[PDB]
Every structure is written in C-alpha cells, then in structure tokens.
C-alpha cells in the first residue's frame, strides 16, 4: 500500500486544441499544435514540490 | 530475352547490364524528395530550392 494512493497526478492542457499565445500575431486568434504532438512529460520531483502544490 | 547460343545475344546481355548501371548512377545523384506537412499532417508542398 505504500505510495499506491494519491501518489501520481496527470494535469491536462489546451495546447493541442487551441489557445491564444503571448507572441506577436497569436494574441487575438486561437491556434493549437494539431492532432499530432508529443504526449507526456515528467515533472521533476527531487524537492517534492508536487506535495506542496501539484 | 537474349539468345545464349550466339555472341550477339551475349552482347545484348552485356548492353542490358551496362544500362542498369547507368540508371543506378543517376539515382546516386538524385536528391531525396522533401515534403512539408502541417500539425494535422495535411501536405503543404514539396521543397526543391533549399541551400
């Protein structure tokens, strides 16, 4: 049971579908990456930051 | 098909093999076909003018 319950989190994002971005010309329109993109990246945990706020 | 009974068909076989060497020597010099596609993989174009 040790580190089975509440031991991981996935946080999603609107990157694939569409966002307005703080880049010249992307502030008023909505653009997304596309249907093809890299899926997951690991948040480094050595200082335990996810236990203060994930 | 070449005649293996006579020297003239041995020359047709030699000429046929030297022809295939030239096609490979041209494909040695041909650049790759380059294509650019968007985030949904729709084709934008073929690229030909690169440095």
Token pair for residue B9?
Answer: 């068909």
Distance of alpha carbon A41 from alpha carbon A19, whole angstroms: 19
Resolution limit in angstroms?
2.8
Give A23 to chain B, closest Cα distance, Å.
18
Residue that the structure tokens 């041209």 belong to: B26
Chain A neighbors of B39, CB-CB under 8 A: 32-37
Task: Report helix, strand or coil for A31.
Answer: strand
CA distance B32 to B27: 10
B45 Cβ contact partners less than 8 Å away, ≥ 6 residues apart: B35, B36
- Strand segments, DSSP code E, in chain A are none
* A24 vs A18: CA distance, rounded Å: 16
- Residue window 7-46, chain A: list those with CB within 8 Å of chain B: 32-37
- Torsion on CA atoms B45, B49, B50, B51, rounded to nearest 10: 180
The C-alpha atoms of residue A27 and residue A25 are separated, in whole angstroms, by 6
Q: Beta partners for B37?
A: B43
Contacts of A35 in chain B (CB under 8 A): 39-41
The values of phi and psi at residue B46, to 5°, are -90, 135
Solved with:
cryo-EM
Give the containing element (helix H, strand E) for B25: helix B7-27
CA–CA gap between residue B26 and residue A29 (Å, rounded): 48
């Amino acid at each position: 049971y040790e580190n089975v319950v509440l031991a991981f989190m996935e946080i999603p994002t609107l990157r694939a579908a569409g966002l307005s971005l703080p880049i010249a010309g992307l502030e008023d329109i909505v653009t997304g990456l596309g249907d093809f993109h890299y899926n997951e990246g690991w948040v480094d945990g050595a200082d335990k930051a996810f236990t203060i706020s994930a | 098909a070449a005649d293996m009974t006579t020297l003239a068909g041995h020359q047709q076989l030699w000429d046929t093999v030297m022809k295939r060497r030239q096609k490979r020597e041209d494909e040695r010099i041909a650049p790759p076909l380059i294509r650019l596609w968007d985030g949904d993989y729709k084709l934008r174009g073929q690229l030909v003018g690169e440095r």
